[PDB]
């Protein structure tokens, strides 16, 4: 028939050269936009790409993971098609891989799927991604740690059930430790993930407090780095949006003195955020 379903037919071919050629083309189409992603889906590529995730052939695996992560970068309905095809069990299994290239690509697809709706984020949790993601926060490999933080932040940006699943997987003590990191990129991502957990209910905001995040957050307000300051202010302001018990905990941590000083900062974005955080605590 048409050119795209023919490429899909070559994905199960005994000729590995014919397989790689068709796989390379479908991957290139899937990286060209939502309309091009749908053409790949309609040709029936997803069941065939999912089958290739089990391949012991790293050359096939790298192109198949590249294609799926790109299909997962489209709309919510396109992300759902990736889940419906049964990609999540294969993606979760690849998190225990000693191959850093396969691992990073599995982390790309999982974070992209976890960037969809609440029910889609829940499907990533139900597949069992959280234990491996929490474990990867202890990795000495800065690239893997960042990809794992990105995937965790996307899961933590979900609703009550999703944030609760992140807390229950023991992600908070690891995230609080990462606040004392010499790496500005890692610090930003740990602050992004903490802000998302603190964007939940009063009990979930309290879990961030019980984890010991406030002393580290209050100290980050004395940073000469305006970018770190904005990230730290975003996290504290989310905690400030909690109940009176949570508001009092921020006051005891010594935030009011620092927030009063930050109202006089040269940077306008820092001024607005610190004034807003102080408004939440004093009222």
């Amino acid at each position: 028939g048409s050119e795209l379903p023919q490429m899909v037919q070559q994905l199960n071919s005994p000729d590995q050269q014919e397989l790689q050629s068709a796989l390379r083309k479908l991957s290139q189409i899937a990286s060209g936009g939502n309309e091009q992603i749908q053409a790949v889906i309609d040709a029936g590529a997803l069941p065939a790409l999912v089958q290739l995730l089990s391949s012991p052939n790293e050359q096939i695996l790298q192109e198949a993971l590249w294609a799926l992560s790109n299909i997962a970068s489209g709309g919510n309905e396109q992300i759902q098609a990736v889940i419906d095809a049964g990609a999540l069990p294969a993606l979760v299994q690849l998190l225990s891989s000693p191959n850093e290239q396969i691992l990073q690509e599995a982390l790309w697809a999982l974070s992209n799927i976890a960037s969809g709706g609440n029910e889609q984020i829940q499907a990533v949790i139900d597949a069992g991604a959280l234990p491996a993601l929490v474990q990867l926060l202890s990795s000495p490999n800065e690239q893997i740690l960042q990809e794992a933080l990105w995937a965790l932040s996307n899961i933590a940006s979900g609703g009550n059930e999703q944030i609760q699943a992140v807390i229950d997987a023991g992600a908070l003590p690891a995230l609080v430790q990462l606040l004392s990191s010499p790496n500005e990129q890692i610090l930003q991502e740990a602050l992004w993930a903490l802000s998302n957990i603190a964007s939940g209910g009063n009990e979930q905001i309290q879990a961030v407090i019980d984890a010991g995040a406030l002393p580290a957050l209050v100290q980050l307000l004395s940073s000469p780095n305006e970018q770190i300051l904005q990230e730290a202010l975003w996290a504290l302001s989310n905690i400030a949006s909690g109940g009176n018990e949570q508001k009092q905990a921020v006051k005891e941590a010594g935030a009011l003195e620092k927030l009063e000083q930050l109202q006089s900062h040269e940077n306008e974005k820092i001024q607005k955020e610190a004034q807003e955080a102080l408004e939440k605590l004093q009222s």
Binding site: S31, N70, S73, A114, S115, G116, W150, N154, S157
Partner: peptide, 8 residues
């Protein structure tokens, strides 16, 4: 919920 498409 940031989505990333391919390299660069």
């Amino acid at each position: 919920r940031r989505r990333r498409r391919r390299r660069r």
